[PDB]
Write a protein that binds this ligand. Structure first.
Ligand code: NAP
Ligand code: NAP
Ligand code: LYS
Lengths: 300, 299
């Protein structure tokens, strides 16, 4: 120790791990106080040259804690996780967490789609076509008897067989509105700073999920729309004070956090469709540390 | 890369670097805006198991940032405390060095206090007292030895009243009490692992420079916090440390002390911008990142 895991081996090890299962466990443990989610810290480089965020997790029950450091340089974004022992204070693992991040994000949304989507859902929209959107598809393509799956990004008109080759039910829409038309579940998987979908423009109640974080107060629905949605999120205690649409809604549209009807801890320990349903994830250090730990236990 | 440097190798490379040099440059560099010193983060483990502190630094000059993590694991008769520094690249966002920072830390703590003693002690200061006799006290004694014409050096810990004879004779007396050790002292260096007061600046026979370094508890402090109201207060970095240093937090919360009485920090002292004297060090990530980066340059 410490084992140093570069990208290739990390991906090989990633493939041998049930991320949905690991995060499922992590949330029930968080619900029971067996894991602790510390605050993130963000530090700007001088002269616009970029930022870095440190994400933390304490897995008390497993006797490990960690930091993922993610620099954004000018646009290069990497991620590395250091796992430390709570028993002897020594480093266990230093792991390239670039792919681990993508997986946990999609698997976290996935857990929320499983807990929240109505059992008989048939139509799926994915907005965004990057790796996070593809992972989202990979991790939700089996959760329901989807008849139809729609995908839209701007760039998609102007490589297309990869996208349609991830599922036989997937077709490229020419517009957001086409993709989401008649959708039971809509997964917003974009880099967008600002709204990509108004829930007022829906033909029926849907489950809407959102993951965009790359911007100060980045958000994918209109902040006012939270007041018209049944609102869920990854963690009650952290996400409302950082999710852009949630801040803006509370500062300007009189939205109160107490309107949050459940987080994943509450959903997955059973403590938590006449209106649309909104699920917000912004990423939790605990997800990063859980995953790195799973690699560490696998690496032994 | 990344290189992993364990304890024994870290010490050897440490012997090859000029710590006071590096910290002098560093603190001038921080005053001039060329490096960022964000606040430390303390995270409690659940159920009284302990905590960790993460120290950050951006050395934008040398194209590196990093994080030193320091777990504090509660034990039966004393905490187990470690320190590992991860140094990252600002060009490609990859790790450069994961280094055991146990001894690096000891060195940058003593050297930080030596910078402070230089800039704050009377140029005609004669008698020196050191409270504590462990690794940190040994480092202090060896970094501050040629800063003044010391005519007497006294030293106290309750165990003396091994690896220090390795520093007794690395540079003069061992007192039988705290009081005896600090009689007529011009500079008193508190170099303990104490969580609470080891010296009351009100029982001194005359004014002195009093320095403090202990971080061996969430709010460790080596002087009664109320005493900060009767002392001219300086610290390593005024932007962050007044909000973490035990005695400053307690004084502010209960003794009506206010952080704006901080008459200077080290960036200010070593850029001529500053003004009984107390100096408080709790460690700063930049110091940690600077020293780690030195070891990385050596490879
Ligand atoms: N919540 C979390 O846990 C977490 C963690 C890390 C990252 N993230 C977020 O995940 C996002 C997706 O990551 P990625 O690697 O898949 O990124 P990416 O490769 O940059 O993909 C972004 C996608 O958003 C699409 N998009 C659709 N409508 C858009 C609109 N109106 N404005 C902007 N973009 C629009 C883009 O279309 P084009 O084809 O036209 O570009 C593109 O396909 C990141 O940008 C980040 O904010 C979330
Ligand atoms: N070690 C580092 O790298 C480093 C770096 C930055 C800050 N610090 C801080 O400095 C502290 C000291 O570190 P160290 O490595 O020198 O520890 P150490 O080797 O255990 O030495 C601590 C010394 O404090 C003495 N001391 C004197 N009066 C005391 C009192 N009233 N209560 C408690 N202790 C008293 C101890 O007495 P005995 O001789 O009777 O045991 C001992 O000599 C750390 O615990 C930490 O807060 C350490
Ligand atoms: N290892 C050090 C702690 C490192 C943190 C320095 N600010 C100690 O014994 O207390």
């Amino acid at each position: 120790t410490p084992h140093v895991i570069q990208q290739a081996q990390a991906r090989e090890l990633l493939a041998q791990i049930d991320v949905p299962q690991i995060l499922h466990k992590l949330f029930r443990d968080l619900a029971a106080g067996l894991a602790v989610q510390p605050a993130q810290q963000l530090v700007a480089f001088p002269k616009g040259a970029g930022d870095f965020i440190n994400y933390l997790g304490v897995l008390a029950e497993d006797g490990v804690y960690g930091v993922k450091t993610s620099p954004y340089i000018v646009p290069l974004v990497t991620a590395w996780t250091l796992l430390m022992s709570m028993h002897n204070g020594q480093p266990l693992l230093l792991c390239d967490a670039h792919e681990l991040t993508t997986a946990r994000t999609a698997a976290t949304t996935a857990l929320a789609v499983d807990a929240l989507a109505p059992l008989a859902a048939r139509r799926l929209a994915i907005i965004g076509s990057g790796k996070v959107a593809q992972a989202h598809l990979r991790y939700v393509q089996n959760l329901r008897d989807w008849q139809h799956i729609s995908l839209f990004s701007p760039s998609l008109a102007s490589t297309l067989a990869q996208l349609t080759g991830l599922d036989p039910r997937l077709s490229i829409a020419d517009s957001c509105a086409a993709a989401v038309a008649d959708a039971d579940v809509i997964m917003l998987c974009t880099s967008s700073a600002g709204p990509v979908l108004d829930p007022a423009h829906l033909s029926k109640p849907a489950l809407i999920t959102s993951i965009s974080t790359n911007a100060p107060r980045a958000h994918e629905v209109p902040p006012h729309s939270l007041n018209a949605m049944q609102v869920f999120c990854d963690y009650r205690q952290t996400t409302p004070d950082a999710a852009g649409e949630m801040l803006i809604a509370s500062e300007q549209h009189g939205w109160d956090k107490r309107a949050v009807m459940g987080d994943l801890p509450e959903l997955l320990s059973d403590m938590a469709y006449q209106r649309p349903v909104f699920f917000r994830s912004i990423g939790l250090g605990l997800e990063d540390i859980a995953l790195a730990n799973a690699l560490y236990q696998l690496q032994r």
